[PDB]
Structure formats: C-alpha cells, structure tokens
Design a protein around this nucleic acid. Sequence first.
RNA 1: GUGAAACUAAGUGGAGGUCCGAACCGACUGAUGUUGAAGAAUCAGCGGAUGAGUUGUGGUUAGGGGUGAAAUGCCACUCG
RNA 2: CAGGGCCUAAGAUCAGGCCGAAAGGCGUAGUCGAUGGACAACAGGUGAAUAUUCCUGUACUACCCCUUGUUGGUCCCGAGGGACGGAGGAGGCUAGGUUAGCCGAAAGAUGGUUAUCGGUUCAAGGACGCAAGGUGACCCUGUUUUUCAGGGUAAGAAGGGGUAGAGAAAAUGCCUCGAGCCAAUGUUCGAGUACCAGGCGCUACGGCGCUGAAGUAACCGAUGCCAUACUCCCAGGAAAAGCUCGAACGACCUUCAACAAAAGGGUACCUGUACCCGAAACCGACACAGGUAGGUAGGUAGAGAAUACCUAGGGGCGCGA
RNA 3: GACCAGGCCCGGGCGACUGUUUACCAAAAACACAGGUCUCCGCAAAGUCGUAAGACCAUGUAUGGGGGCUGACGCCUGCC
Lengths: 60, 253, 49, 96
Amino acid sequence: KAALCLTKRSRSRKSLARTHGFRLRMSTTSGRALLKRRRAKGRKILCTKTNPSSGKRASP
Amino acid sequence: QVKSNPRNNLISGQRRCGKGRNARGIITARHRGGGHKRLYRKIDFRRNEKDIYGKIVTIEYDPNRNAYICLIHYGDGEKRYILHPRGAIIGDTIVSGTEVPIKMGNALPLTDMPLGTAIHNIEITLGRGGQLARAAGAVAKLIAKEGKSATLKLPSGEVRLISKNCSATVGQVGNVGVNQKRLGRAGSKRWLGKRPVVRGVVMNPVDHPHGGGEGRAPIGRKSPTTPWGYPALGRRSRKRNKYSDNFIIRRRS
Amino acid sequence: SKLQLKLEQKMKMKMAKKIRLRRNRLMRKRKLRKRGAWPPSKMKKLKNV
Amino acid sequence: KKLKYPRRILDVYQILQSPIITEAAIKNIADENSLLFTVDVRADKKMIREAISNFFGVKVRKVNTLIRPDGTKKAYIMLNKEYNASELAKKIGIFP
RNA sequence: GUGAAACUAAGUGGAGGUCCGAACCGACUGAUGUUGAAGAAUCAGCGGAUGAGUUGUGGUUAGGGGUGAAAUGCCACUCG
RNA sequence: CAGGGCCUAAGAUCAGGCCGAAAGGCGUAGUCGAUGGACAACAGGUGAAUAUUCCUGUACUACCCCUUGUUGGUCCCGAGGGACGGAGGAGGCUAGGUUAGCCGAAAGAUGGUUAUCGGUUCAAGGACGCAAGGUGACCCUGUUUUUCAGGGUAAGAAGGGGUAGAGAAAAUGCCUCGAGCCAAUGUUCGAGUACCAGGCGCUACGGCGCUGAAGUAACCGAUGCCAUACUCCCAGGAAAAGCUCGAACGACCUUCAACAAAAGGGUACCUGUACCCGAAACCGACACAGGUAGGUAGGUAGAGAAUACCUAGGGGCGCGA
RNA sequence: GACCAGGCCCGGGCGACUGUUUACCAAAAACACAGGUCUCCGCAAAGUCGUAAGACCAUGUAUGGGGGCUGACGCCUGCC
Ligand SMILES: [Mg+2]
Ligand SMILES: [Mg+2]
Ligand SMILES: [Mg+2]
Ligand SMILES: [Mg+2]
Ligand SMILES: [Mg+2]
Ligand SMILES: [Mg+2]
Ligand SMILES: [Mg+2]
Ligand SMILES: [Mg+2]
Ligand SMILES: [Mg+2]
Ligand SMILES: [Mg+2]
Ligand SMILES: [Mg+2]
Ligand SMILES: [Mg+2]
Ligand SMILES: [Mg+2]
Ligand SMILES: [Mg+2]
Ligand SMILES: [Mg+2]
Ligand SMILES: [Mg+2]
Ligand SMILES: [Mg+2]
Ligand SMILES: [Mg+2]
Ligand SMILES: [Mg+2]
Ligand SMILES: [Mg+2]
Ligand SMILES: [Mg+2]
Ligand SMILES: [Mg+2]
Ligand SMILES: [Mg+2]
Ligand SMILES: [Mg+2]
Ligand SMILES: [Mg+2]
Ligand SMILES: [Mg+2]
Ligand SMILES: [Mg+2]
Ligand SMILES: [Mg+2]
Ligand SMILES: [Mg+2]
Ligand SMILES: [Mg+2]
Ligand SMILES: [Mg+2]
Ligand SMILES: [Mg+2]
Ligand SMILES: [Mg+2]
Ligand SMILES: [Mg+2]
Ligand SMILES: [Mg+2]
Ligand SMILES: [Mg+2]
Ligand SMILES: [Mg+2]
Ligand SMILES: [Mg+2]
Ligand SMILES: [Mg+2]
Ligand SMILES: [Mg+2]
Ligand SMILES: [Mg+2]
Ligand SMILES: [Mg+2]
Ligand SMILES: [Mg+2]
Ligand SMILES: [Mg+2]
Ligand SMILES: [Mg+2]
Ligand SMILES: [Mg+2]
Ligand SMILES: [Mg+2]
Ligand SMILES: [Mg+2]
Ligand SMILES: [Mg+2]
Ligand SMILES: [Mg+2]
Ligand SMILES: [Mg+2]
Ligand SMILES: [Mg+2]
Ligand SMILES: [Mg+2]
Ligand SMILES: [Mg+2]
Ligand SMILES: [Mg+2]
Ligand SMILES: [Mg+2]
Ligand SMILES: [Mg+2]
Ligand SMILES: [Mg+2]
Ligand SMILES: [Mg+2]
Ligand SMILES: [Mg+2]
Ligand SMILES: [Mg+2]
Ligand SMILES: [Mg+2]
Ligand SMILES: [Mg+2]
Ligand SMILES: [Mg+2]
Ligand SMILES: [Mg+2]
Ligand SMILES: [Mg+2]
Ligand SMILES: [Mg+2]
Ligand SMILES: [Mg+2]
Ligand SMILES: [Mg+2]
Ligand SMILES: [Mg+2]
Ligand SMILES: [Mg+2]
Ligand SMILES: [Mg+2]
Ligand SMILES: [Mg+2]
Ligand SMILES: [Mg+2]
Ligand SMILES: [Mg+2]
Ligand SMILES: [Mg+2]
Ligand SMILES: [Mg+2]
Ligand SMILES: [Mg+2]
Ligand SMILES: [Mg+2]
Ligand SMILES: [Mg+2]
Ligand SMILES: [Mg+2]
Ligand SMILES: [Mg+2]
Ligand SMILES: [Mg+2]
Ligand SMILES: [Mg+2]
Ligand SMILES: [Mg+2]
Ligand SMILES: [Mg+2]
Ligand SMILES: [Mg+2]
Ligand SMILES: [Mg+2]
Ligand SMILES: [Mg+2]
Ligand SMILES: [Mg+2]
Ligand SMILES: [Mg+2]
Ligand SMILES: [Mg+2]
Ligand SMILES: [Mg+2]
C-alpha cells in the first residue's frame, strides 16, 4: 500500500551494520579491497553504516 | 488407534529446516516449503538390541511417514519406537534374535525365515539399519534362498538378491488405507508442505523447453522434455555399471 | 503414626503451593510488563480510553 | 581468590574531574545531600565510591551516574544522613 | 425397525479453503487529479476477511545467477 | 524497568579435518546469534526540562556477615523437569460501567422546580483461606444422565513411600499409603494524621499557604484472569540453560575449610533513560491530503471495536478580505 | 421516521469451486487446484546444485521420491 519510492524504511541500525558494517568488510577479501580503496580516496568515514555495540548510538 | 501421549525422549525438534535448499541455499528439490511444523521421532530401524522381550504399549501418529508407529517397552525399561506391523494390537509382545518364533513384529536374519514369508523393514547391509519396505502397506516376499544370498520380491515388483545375514521383520506394514484418502482441496496439499507446480507448456521459452508458442502450445519438441533438456519419457537413468547389478535379477514391471 | 505423615505432607504441600503461587503471580506480572500495560497506576489513567 | 581487578585500569586521581556548579545542582545539595561531579567516562561507580570515600573522608550512601549527550560522565554522590552536604560544600568552595 | 443390521423424526454437538460484516489485506467501476496535495493518490462505491490468511522482528537465496499458484513478472522509482 | 555480566532457534563463523590455479568452498566440536526461555518493586509526593530511576512509606532478589547443625563438598558425568498446536463452547471471576445510599455545595434574573451539581479513591507485597466453580475409577437404585441420595468395591486422584533386574537417581515391573485436590478471586494486614469535594486566607492576581465531610450497596459485565481447564479435530503442534534429583568414572579443593538450614544485621556490576513517535522531528527531495509493529478501550442509542452525538484528553487544518 | 442498511428475475458462452497474477494502462476465459494418466527411480535411488569435497532429495524407502501432459463430478476416450 506504500509507494515504490519507499524502499528505504525504518530498519534497526543493528541489522544494517550486520550487513554493511565495519566488522563485516573485514571478513571478506573483497571487503578489504573496499577499505583500501576508500582509504585511497581518503574518505572521512570508512563504513557509513556502523554501530556502537553499546553507547549512545547503541541498538539493544 | 490415535491418542496423543506426553513426549518420550524419542521426540526431538532438531532437524534440517529449509526443505529443498542445499548448502548454496538454492532450491534443489522443488515444490517444498510451507506446511506445519513437525518433530522428529527417532525410530528404531536396526532393532539391533537382541533377546529381550518387548511390549507394545500404544500406537501413535507420526507426521513424517505415512505408516504408524508403536511405542514399545521392555523389561529393562528402555523405550523404542518401531514401525507398526499390520494387524498388531496393543498388549502384543515382540522380540528380535536369531532363533525366534515367526509371527507379527518379530525380527530375524534371513537365514531363519521360512520361504514364502511376507517381510518388511529389510536391511541391505549388515547392521546398517533397515531400509527397504518402510512405507504404508509395503511388503516383500522372500521367494528363494541359495548360497550366501537370499532372494526377495520388492513391493515395486523388482526381484533382487541380498545377503542372507541381513535382519528383517515379519508382517506387512500397517495403515493400509492411507492412499484411499482423497485430499479434496488445495489447502490439504499445502498442509503437507507441497507447493503448487507449474506445467512446462505454460512458461516462457527461457524458462523451460516447452515455451510459449502463440495460443496454446502443443509440445513441438519432437519429444517431451525435462526442465533441463532430457527426454522425459522412458529413458532409463539407472547408472549402467553400478555395483548393485550382479544382485538384481528381474526388473520391476 | 498417620498424623506424623499427614502433618509432614501438609507442611510440604503448603511449601510447594506457596512457591508455586508466588511463581504464578510473578509470571503474570511479566506477561503484563511485556504487553505493556503494567504499572497499575498506568492502567488507571487510561481506563476511560 | 585473587587480587580484585578494578573494572578498568584507570588512574584514580584523574577520574573525578570537577564539581558542577549551577542553579540545578545546589538545590540537589540542599534537599538530597548529594554532590555533583563531572567524571571520566571510562570511570565506574565502585571507583567513584572508593575515590570519594577516601578523599574527603565521608561514608557515601549511593552513587548515580549519567552520561551527557556530549559523552561526559556525571555523578550524583548522595552521602549518608550523618555527614551533612553543606559541610563539604564549604570545604570545597561550592557556596549554597 | 428386525433376532442380527438397514431405515427415519428428535435433541445434543459445533464441521466448514461456509455465509453477512469492521479491523486488516487488496484493487473491480466511476469521478476528480495530469506544470498533481501525491513520480500511481483522494472521493464514492467494490473483493477476501479461520485461511492456499495478515503482519512484526532476525535471517537465507545474487546476475552465464536468484525467485516465480508463470505476467518475462520481481530482484532498492532501473530487468527479454 | 529494557538489553549486557544467563540459555539456546533460524542463521552465521568455524580449531583441528576434506577438497580447491590463488582468493577461497564444504564441514565437526566450539563460539556467536532474540523476535523466544530464565530472572527481583509498588503507591503517593516533588517537579522550568527526569522519575517503577530523586524523596517518604511498606516490599523483594543475589551475594557477604555472624550464631547453630553436620562432615567431605566442587565440577565432569546419569536423569526428572523446563517443553510448547488449532478450533469450540460452557463455567467461576474480576477490570470497568450504571444506578441507589451516604456527604458536601447549590438558586444558575423565565411558567414551574431541587427532580440539580460535585465527591464516594487506594498499589506491589505478606499472612490467611476456597464453593453454587473445576477435577477425583466402577456397580446397583432413582433425580432428564447432570448438580444429588444410600450402599459397596480397596488404590481407585492430586500426592507420597517401598522393593526387584547389570540397576544411585531415573525408566520399567510388582506391593503399599492416601479422599481430597486445583486456582483465579475473596477476607485481613499493607492503609492513614495518605488522597480528595469543598472551606479559609494571600494574590507578582501566575500560583500559593492553611483546615478537611462521607469514603458503602445492588444490578449489568468482558475480547482480560483461572487455562497448556476442559471437549473435539488432523495438518500432530522449538532447543538449551537456570531448576529438582543422583552411585560408580575423572579432575580439583579440603578444616574452623566447605556445604545445610531459620532468624538477624550489612552489601548493591556496566549501557539506554531528554523530546517526537495514527509524526512539521521516522519513511515519502517539501512544515507533502501518503506509509509506519505493539499497548490502554468511558457515555447514550446499537448485534458491534459499524454508525451518529458526546466525556477524558487534544485541536480550529501558517494566506486573508 | 437520522446515520447505518441486499435491487431482483429469465437466458446463454467460458472456467467446476475459495484462491493467484502483469508494483505504476490488462484480474481474465490466463495460472493454480483436488482428481486423472504416462515415464523414470531398489537406496552408495533417480533428479538438482557444485571445478571438486560435498549439499539437497531424506535423518525419507516404491501406499515413497523425480519429471511430462490433462484438469472437480458424470458419460467417454475411435482409427494410423
Ligand atoms: Mg548516508
Ligand atoms: Mg517436545
Ligand atoms: Mg520431557
Ligand atoms: Mg551460505
Ligand atoms: Mg497434480
Ligand atoms: Mg500444474
Ligand atoms: Mg504465458
Ligand atoms: Mg530457475
Ligand atoms: Mg531453449
Ligand atoms: Mg513449444
Ligand atoms: Mg493457435
Ligand atoms: Mg473510546
Ligand atoms: Mg535533579
Ligand atoms: Mg581512560
Ligand atoms: Mg544509568
Ligand atoms: Mg447452538
Ligand atoms: Mg470464509
Ligand atoms: Mg443479512
Ligand atoms: Mg486494474
Ligand atoms: Mg476506496
Ligand atoms: Mg469491504
Ligand atoms: Mg457489499
Ligand atoms: Mg458481497
Ligand atoms: Mg465478507
Ligand atoms: Mg476452521
Ligand atoms: Mg510469520
Ligand atoms: Mg510485504
Ligand atoms: Mg507471486
Ligand atoms: Mg541504487
Ligand atoms: Mg524495480
Ligand atoms: Mg516491464
Ligand atoms: Mg544451528
Ligand atoms: Mg566458511
Ligand atoms: Mg582450517
Ligand atoms: Mg557446529
Ligand atoms: Mg548473546
Ligand atoms: Mg526479548
Ligand atoms: Mg527484568
Ligand atoms: Mg538481566
Ligand atoms: Mg516530559
Ligand atoms: Mg511514581
Ligand atoms: Mg529506591
Ligand atoms: Mg503508603
Ligand atoms: Mg531473597
Ligand atoms: Mg543436563
Ligand atoms: Mg513457547
Ligand atoms: Mg467467559
Ligand atoms: Mg467495581
Ligand atoms: Mg439518573
Ligand atoms: Mg436520598
Ligand atoms: Mg427558571
Ligand atoms: Mg450525583
Ligand atoms: Mg492482597
Ligand atoms: Mg514472610
Ligand atoms: Mg465442591
Ligand atoms: Mg534404582
Ligand atoms: Mg538399589
Ligand atoms: Mg519409581
Ligand atoms: Mg451476572
Ligand atoms: Mg476474536
Ligand atoms: Mg487485542
Ligand atoms: Mg490441547
Ligand atoms: Mg570419584
Ligand atoms: Mg544439598
Ligand atoms: Mg525517563
Ligand atoms: Mg520518557
Ligand atoms: Mg502547514
Ligand atoms: Mg502531512
Ligand atoms: Mg500521516
Ligand atoms: Mg462505546
Ligand atoms: Mg442497526
Ligand atoms: Mg447496551
Ligand atoms: Mg467511528
Ligand atoms: Mg472539550
Ligand atoms: Mg476567499
Ligand atoms: Mg451499501
Ligand atoms: Mg447483505
Ligand atoms: Mg452465466
Ligand atoms: Mg448449447
Ligand atoms: Mg455467441
Ligand atoms: Mg475461475
Ligand atoms: Mg464468498
Ligand atoms: Mg503475491
Ligand atoms: Mg497493471
Ligand atoms: Mg498484487
Ligand atoms: Mg478478479
Ligand atoms: Mg497468470
Ligand atoms: Mg544420487
Ligand atoms: Mg507412485
Ligand atoms: Mg508425482
Ligand atoms: Mg489446460
Ligand atoms: Mg474430464
Ligand atoms: Mg451429472
């Protein structure tokens, strides 16, 4: 019943960083190539989706 | 006939979960999925515990096979499940061993079975556990025995040699009228976790060898075909030289 | 000799039923906390809703 | 059994950073006999209780921590009923 | 009712991919809208509504692929 | 209180192991992983912005401390338990509501009238307790079988004890003891100098200080509770820990050391906590006629959570004339 | 007496039926279905996925598992 454009919904930050998070890029080889690549371009943030396990941004 | 007991230690929840998905997670065996949660009953197919006197306490439903299953006790207090033989009634006594009476539910090697008997739950391999004739109403006659080898006629009609030292059980497998059921509606299939099947002729040419012709397709294929490109009808798939071949005599008709 | 067994078994029964019942309100309180109208005060501001 | 390891390894002399003096805290002192101390984020309650119990020599009832949105731990230290708050208020230089 | 059984009112019972209809899921007709209030909506009606139902959270399957009650449909407004 | 210091599901990673140009793929123990198991707190008050968190009352878990009582305890292991569907209706109850009764105030410029307006509230928890409820085998006689009445049978229910087999507990078999049992709710404490209609006084005319009457009964009645209680059905309805029990095997620890108990005192880990959340704060590029799980469920009519008009509470749609 | 709140009857085609479908121009006579029938497969099964190891099928065993056509029930299914 929701419009096509709604692809990004409200999803638990926990779930996202279990997908695009830091500790996941570190697992695969291709991810490590990712991080070398981003460091080369020199981005301020390596992993956009990430998340404190506990803290102010924590998802329980 | 069917009355639910509490749970004996024989009933667990551990199992494969995705039905028909392999390691890669791909659907391999098609059409499964959906359907009621089930628990695994640990059957005793081996019946390997010898020379103690077992007693049928109850008869119970099993979701996993279409036969019935019996809770049996012993004097030792161990409890097993066995496949329910046909005509067996609560209070009955069964036993396995070498020198044993021949009656319903008793289990013995093929050395000791009088020829012409009707058997179920048949090991092809010593101590591997019983394999052949485990479904409802399934039964196999022991026709002849010679040398180290005994001959059976399997419920498919196929006549085949096995080892004379492999255990088996007398009596045909119970719950014979199960295929006399008529499901009556779609839902009734879905309850069994069998999903709907699409006919080949219907799908697009990319999806399947009988692909969309204009209106309705006769199969122009010079032959009826698998989803994967092999002749659908009467092409024998048995591995040509498979080790079993010396054993197999007449083929099911 | 029967009065001993009866008073012992009623001591036991009083105990087990004490613990049981205690356990039961505890669970009820939990289910309510989960569902989320718990603290009876909460429920009494909203009775008229 | 063994030596008791403190939750982290800190240096106690840096954990209590300072009293927080605003209109808010002072009446918390008045009512509740409770001091207000900005402390190191990495610092816990057991460490704050030992620290202040030894430092000003007062027995402390209870400690309540907090973390600002700015990531600076803030601790309410409510002392016993015996030792008055305003005592330590004049001892420290916090004037109610 | 006959010796067995069949046959027939009665009560009890509460089956059903039963019926009517909100929530909820849909999307049949019309009107409006078309530099929209909105990159698919509002309005009045309309279909299912104990099931082959709806949904939440957490997962799986990935492009010579996946998934498909099969429309070349869907796979982040992108899919021969 | 919600997650973590507890346990596992789908799933993930995976020591060794198997395979593979490389990167890697499969896979066992292990370890992760809640949306589930386990586990202890409520009422009132304060309050520019927090409150089951701060204050006052009564509570409850887990440790430590003493007294007493025993001598082996701890883990590994063996077990019982935890532990489970759908549908259906009938009970027995509360939550709410309505009307009485009690108490206080009332004159609201009209033809009449007090028929009017307000109040009648209290939690977790602890002690008690359970029938017209529900369950407790059969046989004879009647009440429609039922709720019942007399007799009898000898385990015939929760619940306990014993024995036997390689056999501690368990399972299993034989013997025995028990007519009660179940649990919502209820009575009493908690609980009154709490709360509160009004009354008195101040007005920075915002709010404030002061004293406080009555505080019961009947009838409606849940979709909530007992309750995994029944009855029926086929499609047959999670695991593991805490928990209860226990010999041999292994490991480790041992005397004022450890464990067992009823009192008494003491002691109290991290992280979230603001605000919005049928949204001008999330998702729709907008202060966008849209999407967004769950909880609570008042009145009159009504079969109803539909509809219409209202309470509590919130609003008058950020261009007008 | 407001709001709320079925128009119905007689015919025929197609499809038995509840369902599913082309998000955003098509909801149907299309798909599914219970049922039917043909063929493969004796368990180290056939089939599917992988270079392989192995995984699914299945902790199943021919009253079971693949695959092809048709499509409830009734009457049938001719010749080459
Ligand atoms: Mg971004
Ligand atoms: Mg179970
Ligand atoms: Mg069990
Ligand atoms: Mg994978
Ligand atoms: Mg079919
Ligand atoms: Mg089909
Ligand atoms: Mg087509
Ligand atoms: Mg495919
Ligand atoms: Mg092709
Ligand atoms: Mg074709
Ligand atoms: Mg044509
Ligand atoms: Mg309402
Ligand atoms: Mg404060
Ligand atoms: Mg530091
Ligand atoms: Mg905190
Ligand atoms: Mg009726
Ligand atoms: Mg229906
Ligand atoms: Mg009607
Ligand atoms: Mg349309
Ligand atoms: Mg509409
Ligand atoms: Mg409708
Ligand atoms: Mg209608
Ligand atoms: Mg209609
Ligand atoms: Mg309807
Ligand atoms: Mg039904
Ligand atoms: Mg679901
Ligand atoms: Mg969806
Ligand atoms: Mg689809
Ligand atoms: Mg994109
Ligand atoms: Mg798209
Ligand atoms: Mg397209
Ligand atoms: Mg697992
Ligand atoms: Mg791996
Ligand atoms: Mg390795
Ligand atoms: Mg593993
Ligand atoms: Mg965890
Ligand atoms: Mg949880
Ligand atoms: Mg808790
Ligand atoms: Mg916890
Ligand atoms: Mg607030
Ligand atoms: Mg409060
Ligand atoms: Mg407190
Ligand atoms: Mg009080
Ligand atoms: Mg305690
Ligand atoms: Mg255990
Ligand atoms: Mg459960
Ligand atoms: Mg009821
Ligand atoms: Mg009442
Ligand atoms: Mg009245
Ligand atoms: Mg009166
Ligand atoms: Mg007047
Ligand atoms: Mg009144
Ligand atoms: Mg009480
Ligand atoms: Mg007590
Ligand atoms: Mg009674
Ligand atoms: Mg024993
Ligand atoms: Mg013994
Ligand atoms: Mg026993
Ligand atoms: Mg009544
Ligand atoms: Mg309902
Ligand atoms: Mg509800
Ligand atoms: Mg049941
Ligand atoms: Mg030992
Ligand atoms: Mg002990
Ligand atoms: Mg708060
Ligand atoms: Mg808040
Ligand atoms: Mg606006
Ligand atoms: Mg808006
Ligand atoms: Mg909105
Ligand atoms: Mg109403
Ligand atoms: Mg009406
Ligand atoms: Mg009424
Ligand atoms: Mg309404
Ligand atoms: Mg108003
Ligand atoms: Mg105008
Ligand atoms: Mg209408
Ligand atoms: Mg109607
Ligand atoms: Mg017609
Ligand atoms: Mg005609
Ligand atoms: Mg015509
Ligand atoms: Mg149709
Ligand atoms: Mg209909
Ligand atoms: Mg769909
Ligand atoms: Mg369309
Ligand atoms: Mg659709
Ligand atoms: Mg349609
Ligand atoms: Mg279609
Ligand atoms: Mg194979
Ligand atoms: Mg077959
Ligand atoms: Mg088939
Ligand atoms: Mg067709
Ligand atoms: Mg036909
Ligand atoms: Mg006919």
